[PDB]
Structure 1
Amino acid sequence: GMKIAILGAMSEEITPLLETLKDYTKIEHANNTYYFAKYKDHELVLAYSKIGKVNSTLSASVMIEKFGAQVLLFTGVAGAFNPELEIGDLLYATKLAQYDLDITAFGHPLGFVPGNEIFIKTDEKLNNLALEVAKELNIKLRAGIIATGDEFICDEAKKAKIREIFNADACEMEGASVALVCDALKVPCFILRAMSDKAGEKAEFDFDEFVINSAKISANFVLKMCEKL
């Protein structure tokens, strides 16, 4: 088997996995809790990072560098941009950008800084494994572009703008950051999100209503990938 990191942002995104696993140990590190469990020949390390790009960047780095994760699967929820996405639908990111990284005053495109690309890619083999698991268990799974930034998006103008600029199918606050860390540290990354809202007016209310259930959909799916890994 192998060491696998499973990461969400919030307790709701990781608690369903801890309940399924039953037996696990906990370790305080980096002002957070990291959870350790065996599963089908694999050694799992799980955590919720707390919200946003910095927190998620630190959790990814800790899980790989201190705890030796060889693969990282991200599971959580997201705001839908693509009108064909409904609440509860699963989307995996083929590539991701930071919509709020902005040095456009120097004539560079939005999302770009020197040394880096605008879009960071996820691992192709993990994405194909996800497609087989989706086919095998008759689950609907969509591929797409996720736009990451440190704002909860609940505004039609902002939604439209980010979608237009990056051709994004959903938005969230941890994806591109986690993907960047994994790529830099040479670890295969997979980013999965279940929609909790549509990122327009009253998205905050839809988020509160659907987060728990959508988080379970995503959570279940990444554990099914661990079976096939």
Structure 2
Amino acid sequence: MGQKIGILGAMREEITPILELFGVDFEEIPLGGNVFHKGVYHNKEIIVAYSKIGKVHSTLTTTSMILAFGVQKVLFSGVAGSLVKDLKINDLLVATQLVQHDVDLSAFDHPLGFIPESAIFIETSGSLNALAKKIANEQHIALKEGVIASGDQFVHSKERKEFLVSEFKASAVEMEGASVAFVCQKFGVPCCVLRSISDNADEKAGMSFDEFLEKSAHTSAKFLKSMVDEL
């Protein structure tokens, strides 16, 4: 058999298209409040789950994928808010680095985003990111490679947008990427975080999110499947 691949989304809506697109039989396995969908695709074992929203949920689920299911790589798919003009609704990006944008130990003179015995930016797999870029070029689609800021707030203001851009030079904002990538780094598991834009993280982001969740989730899922087809 090939590698075992963990495939993660945050919301059920982000994994529904994944399960459908792979099209194989899945066994449902409950653990730690999550349901893991276990299947075989192109002689690879795939484990698919949605974590539920936010850093604690996604940390837990990623740790379970690694410790309980023994996945050898983790691919994340879902939606995100755009922080840069060149990322429009439906556009894709892969995260070259991620940060937890809501971490604040400034009382002890630490840079924002920094925790002692850790680092501001978390790295993802250069190999998987390069693969994504090659596939995007072949398919003639744009693919941004940039910084993703993750936090436990849904961002919907110009003020917070300006902070994420100024402080971290982030291209998109979401609520799980940094934590998924962090867990993978700690266990030496290659990680790729893929997102499709659903909104502009501004005052109208809630309504945009609702309008575009289904399409953007599908766009990311279809691209993730394209990557697995090359693995």
Question: Taking structure 1 as the reference length, what is the TM-score of the superposition?
Answer: 0.98
CA distance in 2, matches of 1:83, 1:226: 29
Alignment of 1:170-181 (within 5 A): 170-181=172-183
Residue number in structure 1 paired with 2:78: 76
Distance of 2:54 and 2:164 partners within structure 1: 17
- 3-state secondary structure, aligned to 2:140: coil
1:88-142, Cα deviation, whole Å (9 max, x unpaired): 0001100010011111010010010111010001010111111111122222211
Q: Is the 8 A contact 2:21 2:222 kept in 1?
A: no
| 1:37 is the counterpart of 2:61 | no
User: Does structure 2 conserve the Cα–Cα contact (< 8 Å) formed by 1:21 and 1:37?
Assistant: no
Percentage identity across aligned positions? 50
Structure 1 gaps, min length 5: none
The farther-off stretch of 151-160 and 18-27 is 18-27
Deviations, residues 176-219 of structure 1 (Å, cap 9, x unaligned): 10000000000000000000000001100000000110000000
Q: Which deviations, in whole Å up to 9, do the C-alpha atoms of 1:11-64 show, x marking residues without a partner?
A: 111000111233211011111100011111110000000000000001110001
Distance across 1 between alignment mates of 2:13 and 2:33: 18
- Runs of 4 or more off by more than 2 Å in structure 1? none
What stretches of structure 2 of length at least 5 have no aligned partner?
none
Question: TM-score, length-normalised on structure 2?
Answer: 0.98
How many residue pairs match? The answer is: 229
Q: Which residue of 2 aligns with 1:194?
A: 196
Asked if 1:20 corresponds to 2:21, the answer is yes
2:48 paired with 1:46: yes
The equivalent position to 2:100 in structure 1, one of 98, 101, 105, is 98
Q: Is the 8 A contact 2:35 2:49 kept in 1?
A: yes
Query: How far did 1:154 drift?
Result: 0.5
Q: Choose the corresponding residue for 2:209, options 199, 207, 210.
A: 207
Distance in 2 of aligned mates of 1:127 and 1:115: 26
Q: Which amino acid aligns with 1:181?
A: V
Mapped pair 1:124 → 2:126: yes
For residue 5 of structure 2, what is the aligned residue in structure 1?
4
Match in the other structure for 2:162: 160
- Aligned Cα root-mean-square deviation (Å): 0.7
The CA distance in 1 between the partners of 2:12 and 2:72, in whole Å, is 23
Match for residue 59 of structure 2?
Answer: 57
